[PDB]
Structure 1
Amino acid sequence: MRWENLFVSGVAAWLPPLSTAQDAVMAGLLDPARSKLRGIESVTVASDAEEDAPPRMAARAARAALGRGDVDPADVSLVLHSSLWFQGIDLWPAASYVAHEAVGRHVPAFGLAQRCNGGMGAIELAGAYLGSGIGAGHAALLTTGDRFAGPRIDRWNSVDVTMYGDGAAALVLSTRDGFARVLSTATGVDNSLEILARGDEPFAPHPVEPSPVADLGTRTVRGAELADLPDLTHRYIDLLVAAKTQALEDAGTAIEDIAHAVIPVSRRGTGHELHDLLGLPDERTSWAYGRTTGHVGAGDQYAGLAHLVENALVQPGDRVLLFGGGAGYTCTAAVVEILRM
């Protein structure tokens, strides 16, 4: 999709302190060979205090993002809150809390689930919503937030390809103006890969209690065996190249003109990495930053863009590729042009 009137008016991350892979190895929580393979140096870790529940971190990130774009909360017509896991209280609309605290009483709020891709996918849904004439306002607030905890989640081991960081991020879209223009979005998808995210786990009538420790690495392996596809890996490559190519082509931008690409935090550590598939070197990606935060739920792309802007790592005229991807498997990409700093 080529966007003629869609802007990022603000972006922010609210992140707790860093905790190092080194300290996890020293404490016996993380196998040292795994630490070395994956290349992740540290991950953000929140306290267990109520003030650090995901919706409250999200509400703070939202305020920061709305403050920086000087958007009147009266002009926000939609709130989307994406996440991966528990929000602190069950049977309860977390998204309405985020909206109430950051914007106000009279804005429609949805929780969104598209696993790791939720932040990027929300951009398409919100952009469509803003252009449709449903709401009178010109902005949408997009938030993410998660805080991982035992017994269910071991941040260092529950996923093979990454390590989980706690925290929240926010991105405010506008059809009026902003410091960046969204030039394009495009989604690649292959829903056959959903099997890799459940493995041989049976459908249970009730959450399993007490919670065993999650092991998504082992789901992927069992998932691959049950699916018995001859071309598993290609299905991934195809959907990722589709998202990349359409996002670039609809933005009228060649890959050599991308100043920086913000990607999901993950690492194989052996052969080809995502950056090889994207056709650009490691140092033009957000890996150097991401390997300090870990995988911050659905918010890697918002947090990474926040990092670039806050540190003047981009200037006006630069084009930035935001690259999603999450279990499903779904990947939304976007090209953003910096207009003002």
Structure 2
Amino acid sequence: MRWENLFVSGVAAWLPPLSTAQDAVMAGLLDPARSKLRGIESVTVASDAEEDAPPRMAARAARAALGRGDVDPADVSLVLHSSLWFQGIDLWPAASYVAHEAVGRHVPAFGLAQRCNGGMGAIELAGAYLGSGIGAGHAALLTTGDRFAGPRIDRWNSVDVTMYGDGAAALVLSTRDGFARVLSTATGVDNSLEILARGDEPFAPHPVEPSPVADLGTRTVRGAELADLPDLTHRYIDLLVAAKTQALEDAGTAIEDIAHAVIPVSRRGTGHELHDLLGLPDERTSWAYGRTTGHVGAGDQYAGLAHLVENALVQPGDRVLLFGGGAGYTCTAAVVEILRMP
């Protein structure tokens, strides 16, 4: 999609303090071979106090993003809140709370699920809503938030390719104006890969109690055995490349013209990483940052963009690739152009 009239007006993360991989190793929580292989130096870890429940971290991130863009809460016509896991109370609309705390009473709010890609997919959905004439305002608030805890989540081991960080991020879109122009978005998708996110886990009628520790790595191997696909790796490569190619082409931009790619926090540790597939070096991606925070739910792309702008790592005239990807397997990419520095 080529966007004629879409902007990023504000962006921010609320992250708790860093907890090092060295300390996880020393506490016997993390095998050092694994620490080294995945490259993640630290992840963000919140307290178990109620103030750090994911909808409250998101509320704080949303307020910071709205304040940094000087968008008026009264002009926000939509709230989308993306997440991966428990928001702290069940049978309850977390998104309305985020909306109520950061924007107010009369804004439609939805919870959004597209695993790790929710942050990015929310941009397409919000952008479409803002163009439609359904709501009066010119802006949409997009939030993410998670806080991982045990017994179910082991942040250091429950997913093979990454380690989970706690926290929230926020991105405000406008059809009016912003510090960055969204040139394009594009989604690559291959839903046959959903099986890799369930493996041979049975469909239970109720959550399994005492929760065993999640092992999404083991799921992918049972899933790949079950799927019996001849081109499994090629499926994943093709959707990632379709997203990259279409975002860049719709934006009249080549990869050589991308100053920075903000990417999901994940790592193989040997062989080809996502940057090799994208066609740019390691140091032109958000890796140096993401490896200090871990995979902050659906929020890596917002957080990484906030890192860039806050640390003046881009200037006007630079273009940035925001690159998603989450189990499903769905990947939404965007090309943004820096117009001015807040």
Q: Fold match, TM over 0.5?
A: yes
For residue 245 of structure 1, report the CA deviation from its aligned partner. 0.2
For residue 17 of structure 1, report the CA deviation from its aligned partner. 0.2
For residue 24 of structure 1, report the CA deviation from its aligned partner. 0.3
For residue 261 of structure 1, report the CA deviation from its aligned partner. 0.2
For residue 224 of structure 1, report the CA deviation from its aligned partner. 0.1
For residue 335 of structure 1, report the CA deviation from its aligned partner. 0.2
Q: Secondary structure in 2 aligned to 1:155?
A: coil
Percent of aligned pairs with the same amino acid: 100
Q: Deviations over 1:15-55 (max 9, x none)?
A: 00000001000110001110011110000000000000000
Distance, in Å, in 2 between the alignment partners of 1:34 and 1:298 is: 23
Q: Deviations over 1:73-127 (max 9, x none)?
A: 1110000000000000000000000000000000000000000000000000000
**Structure 1: runs of 5+ lacking an equivalent:** none
Distance, in Å, in 1 between the alignment partners of 2:144 and 2:63 is: 13
Q: Secondary structure in 1 aligned to 2:246?
A: helix
After TM superposition, the structure 1 = structure 2 runs for residues 129-208 of structure 1, keeping only pairs within 5 Å, are: 129-208=129-208
Q: Deviations over 1:213-266 (max 9, x none)?
A: 000000000000000000000000000000000000000001001000000000
Instruction: Give TM-score scaled by structure 2 length.
Output: 1.00
Q: Deviations over 1:116-162 (max 9, x none)?
A: 00000000000000000000100000000000000000000000000
Aligned-residue Cα RMSD (Å) equals 0.3
Distance, in Å, in 1 between the alignment partners of 2:151 and 2:94 is: 22
Q: Deviations over 1:51-79 (max 9, x none)?
A: 00000000000000000111111110000
Q: Secondary structure in 1 aligned to 2:35?
A: helix
Distance, in Å, in 2 between the alignment partners of 1:70 and 1:27 is: 44
Q: Secondary structure in 2 aligned to 1:340?
A: coil
Distance, in Å, in 2 between the alignment partners of 1:197 and 1:255 is: 30
Aligned to 2:279: 279
Aligned to 1:46: 46
Distance, in Å, in 2 between the alignment partners of 1:26 and 1:232 is: 37
Q: Which piece of structure 1 moves more, 67-76 or 237-246?
A: 67-76
Distance, in Å, in 2 between the alignment partners of 1:179 and 1:34 is: 40
For residue 190 of structure 1, report the CA deviation from its aligned partner. 0.2
Distance, in Å, in 1 between the alignment partners of 2:272 and 2:169 is: 29
Distance, in Å, in 1 between the alignment partners of 2:141 and 2:334 is: 17
Aligned to 1:119: 119
For residue 268 of structure 1, report the CA deviation from its aligned partner. 0.3
Q: Secondary structure in 2 aligned to 1:197?
A: helix
Distance, in Å, in 1 between the alignment partners of 2:273 and 2:71 is: 39
Q: Secondary structure in 1 aligned to 2:320?
A: strand
Distance, in Å, in 1 between the alignment partners of 2:324 and 2:192 is: 18
Instruction: Give TM-score scaled by structure 1 length.
Output: 1.00
Distance, in Å, in 2 between the alignment partners of 1:253 and 1:229 is: 34
For residue 11 of structure 1, report the CA deviation from its aligned partner. 0.1
Distance, in Å, in 1 between the alignment partners of 2:67 and 2:273 is: 37
Distance, in Å, in 2 between the alignment partners of 1:5 and 1:58 is: 26
Q: Deviations over 1:149-196 (max 9, x none)?
A: 000000000000000000000000000000000000000000000000
Deviant stretches of 4+, over 6 Å: none
Distance, in Å, in 1 between the alignment partners of 2:194 and 2:234 is: 15
Distance, in Å, in 2 between the alignment partners of 1:14 and 1:273 is: 28
* Number of equivalenced pairs: 341
Aligned to 1:313: 313
Q: Secondary structure in 1 aligned to 2:259?
A: strand
Q: Secondary structure in 2 aligned to 1:104?
A: coil
Q: Secondary structure in 2 aligned to 1:16?
A: coil
Q: Secondary structure in 2 aligned to 1:141?
A: strand
Aligned to 1:268: 268
**Structure 2: runs of 5+ lacking an equivalent:** none
Q: Secondary structure in 1 aligned to 2:9?
A: strand
Distance, in Å, in 2 between the alignment partners of 1:91 and 1:69 is: 33
Q: Secondary structure in 2 aligned to 1:33?
A: helix
Q: Secondary structure in 2 aligned to 1:152?
A: coil
Distance, in Å, in 2 between the alignment partners of 1:320 and 1:161 is: 24
Distance, in Å, in 1 between the alignment partners of 2:38 and 2:95 is: 33
Q: Secondary structure in 2 aligned to 1:169?
A: strand
